[PDB]
Amino acid sequence: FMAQILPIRFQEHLQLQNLGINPANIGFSTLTMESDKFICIREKVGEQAQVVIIDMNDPSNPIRRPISADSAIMNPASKVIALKAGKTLQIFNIEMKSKMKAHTMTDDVTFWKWISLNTVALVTDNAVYHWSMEGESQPVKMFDRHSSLAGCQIINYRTDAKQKWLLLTGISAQQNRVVGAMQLYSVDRKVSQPIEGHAASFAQFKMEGNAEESTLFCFAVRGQAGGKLHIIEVGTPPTGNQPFPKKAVDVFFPPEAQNDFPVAMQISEKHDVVFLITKYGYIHLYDLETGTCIYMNRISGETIFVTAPHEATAGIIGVNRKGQVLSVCVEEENIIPYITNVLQNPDLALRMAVRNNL
Ligand SMILES: O=S(=O)(Nc1nc(O)c(Cc2ccc(Br)cc2)s1)c1cccc2ccccc12
């Protein structure tokens, strides 16, 4: 019953191979998507290093230039790009064709990412730094790396909106298993906590009855107990708030997907829904308040290796290994019908309508 309506809208936005990208460069080491505004690809054509910027508002006109960099990340919003070569980092203003700032690190930066409109996080083998793109400031060390992530491939770093909670995520091969290792750091406490996790995100959520938003930490893991997802408030509730009761739910994997595991998460600011993507190209939806699983489906035939928030729909946008650029968001008009008649969870249907963010 109601087999035809879905709680999500799937969209294809682009096929990068149709825009002249070599499929060999459609991967984590050469293609970045730091927000839904831009895709940046490093390509070696003949002997020439080139960097291609796809403006998602004008994608059929990619800009391609000879630029030598080990890594290239567009600003989430501005026409500004961070470039790295060896231990030397530069931030460049594209629109004004001008160098903004440069810095030479002592240690190699193995992973970097824009964490805000104006700040780029730098991960080295032993520490994490934040670097403002503005003014004269140098990178500032935020914390030292926990031994539990030693030797990991770093896969993500992110913060809460207030930049008081910092999360570093790595994976390692333990025999034939991919084991996720996170470090959660409290700026104010100066304390780290090691956490077995594969994908996470922070979120701000206003509980019924509270005047102030709660800062939530959501992570998903496939460990020895199977797939689990946790939704936890970090630190102490804002003055006047009740605390958010911790939620813990299973994360399902079908029998034919024993080697699947979580790889990405984004949280809808408008809908209070967690989007979880797996290595095999499945998407899951969970309610942020309860952890309730809303929907699961395989949405991509290829691994989706990078994601970002999709701002226009308060959804998730990603790029798969073949170059499909795809998004998923809540279908606002069919979500409650689906919850009512397919999930048959009227409490969730009621709570979503009472939030009234549809
Ligand atoms: O749009 S650009 O400004 N194109 C450029 N092409 C060349 O050749 C540039 C050369 C240049 C060297 C030194 C300075 Br200072 C300024 C520009 S800048 C640009 C700058 C930085 C990174 C880019 C990556 C992909 C596409 C264009 C890029």
> What SS3 class is residue 138?
coil
Distance CA 145, CA 255 (A): 36
Nearest CA to ligand 1 atom 27: 65
Resolved by: X-ray
Distance CA 226, CA 258 (A): 10
Q: At 178, which helix (H) or strand (E)?
A: strand 177-186
Nearest CA to ligand 1 atom 25: 51
* Class of the CATH domain delimited by 1-358: mainly beta
326 CA to centre of own chain = 14
> What SS3 class is residue 342?
helix
Ligand 1 is surrounded, with C-beta below 6 A, by 51, 53, 63, 65, 67, 81, 92, 94, 97, 99
Where do we find the tokens 């070696």?
Answer: 44
31 CA to centre of own chain = 14
Q: Are 129 and 138 in contact (CB under 8 A)?
A: no
DSSP 340: I
Q: Which residues neighbour 304 within 8 Å (Cβ) at sequence distance 6 or greater? A: 263, 264, 277, 281, 318, 319, 320, 321, 326
Q: Which residues neighbour 150 within 8 Å (Cβ) at sequence distance 6 or greater? A: none
Q: Which one, of 171, 182, 179, lies nearest residue 218 by Cα?
A: 182
Count H helices and E strands in the chain, helices first. Answer: 2, 28
- The CB-side HSE value for 248 (13 A sphere, CA atoms) comes to 6
Where do we find the tokens 């690809």?
Answer: 41
Q: Are 217 and 233 in contact (CB under 8 A)?
A: yes
Number of Cβ within a 10 Å radius of residue 232: 16
Nearest CA to ligand 1 atom 6: 65
Q: To 10 degrees, the CA torsion angle through 170, 173, 177, 179?
A: -20
Q: Are 247 and 230 in contact (CB under 8 A)?
A: yes
Instruction: Please write down the HEC assignment for all residues of 257-289.
Output: CCCCCEEEEEECCCCCEEEEEECCCEEEEEECC
Q: Are 214 and 204 in contact (CB under 8 A)?
A: yes
Q: Which residues neighbour 292 within 8 Å (Cβ) at sequence distance 6 or greater? A: 249, 286, 345, 348
Where do we find the tokens 């030292």?
Answer: 144
What is the amino acid identity at position 344? Q
Resolution of the PDB structure in angstroms: 1.7
Task: Find the angle CA(40)-CA(45)-CA(48) to the nearest 5 degrees.
Answer: 90
| CA distances from residue 119 to 28, 304, 312, 318 in whole angstroms, order as listed | 21, 25, 22, 22
State the closest ligand 1 atom to the C-alpha of 94, by its place in the atom list counted from 1.
3
Cα 117 to ligand 1 centroid, rounded to whole Å: 21
From the number of C-beta atoms within 10 Å of its C-beta (0-12, 13-18, 19+), residue 88 rates as middle
Nearest CA to ligand 1 atom 5: 65
Q: At 273, which helix (H) or strand (E)?
A: strand 273-278
Q: Which one, of 254, 257, 306, 248, lies nearest residue 277 by Cα?
A: 306
Q: Give the sheet arrangement for strand 38-45, strand by strand.
A: 31-35, 38-45, 48-55, 63-66
- Ligand 1 probe mutation, 39, 97, 99, 100, most atoms within 8 A of CB: 97
Task: Find the angle CA(129)-CA(131)-CA(132) to the nearest 5 degrees.
Answer: 155
- Ligand 1 probe mutation, 41, 42, 68, 92, most atoms within 8 A of CB: 92
> What SS3 class is residue 65?
strand
User: Where in the chain are the domains?
Assistant: 1-358
Cα 35 to ligand 1 centroid, rounded to whole Å: 21
Distance CA 53, CA 249 (A): 40
What is the amino acid identity at position 333? E
Q: Which two tokens stand for residue 19?
A: 């825009």
